[PDB]
Amino acid sequence: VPDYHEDIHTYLREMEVKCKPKVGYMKKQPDITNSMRAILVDWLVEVGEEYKLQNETLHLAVNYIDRFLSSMSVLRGKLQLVGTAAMLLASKFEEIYPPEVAEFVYITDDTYTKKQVLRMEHLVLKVLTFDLAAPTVNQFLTQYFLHQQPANCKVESLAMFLGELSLIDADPYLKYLPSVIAGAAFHLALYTVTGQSWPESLIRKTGYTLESLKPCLMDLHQTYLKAPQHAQQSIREKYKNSKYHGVSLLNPPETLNL
């Protein structure tokens, strides 16, 4: 009942600022780095495929992980424990029924015990103050998709795809809020499939002009062109499925003609 469509979008915009992580964080982390964060998120993309989890669960786990490394220093040998815990929590929050704890343990090849997983869950919950209802790029896109004229399935998948790529790279994407990245990916997917542009609807909905989206969008264009090269590739492999009309294939526009 879109008598709340407005309020929800307004409220998610209010909550995305509150669920934001420390931008700098990776700098002040003496043992972990962006590239390792990259491997972990890429890994969670596949743990997701293995257990046929919602993309939202995957987005939620990344938010938890960043917010957690924002306050806690983690050694590289325990990184996979944080993430593993965050996916369980995310799974419990978002999925109809989560995977058993024992499966999350299995996928690690016993680098952690069941109890160690549960203990970290608990710690992740203390540090996060049970604030698990974090808005995500995937939540903003979904809200944005209602404003397409009309819904182009290829545009939805590809926007979704670009949104995930942004999860992998703290590198630039930690500097934008989820709604902005969402905006950028939608403009980029639309632009890639049809040549059209950030619709007026959305400009009016988001308060965002194309120009406001331009920095993140240039970054996201770079990421799209560079994607076949990246060290991490689970996302592209995920998006080769008929499920997403294989959008992962279409050729990125070499210029944004912006």
């Binding site: 972990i32 390792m36 491997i39 972990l40 890994w43 590289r76 040998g77 990184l79 996979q80 996928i107 690690t108 090849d109 680098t111």
Partner: peptide, 5 residues
């Protein structure tokens, strides 16, 4: 898999 970091 154990994550190689």
């Amino acid at each position: 898999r154990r994550l190689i970091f």
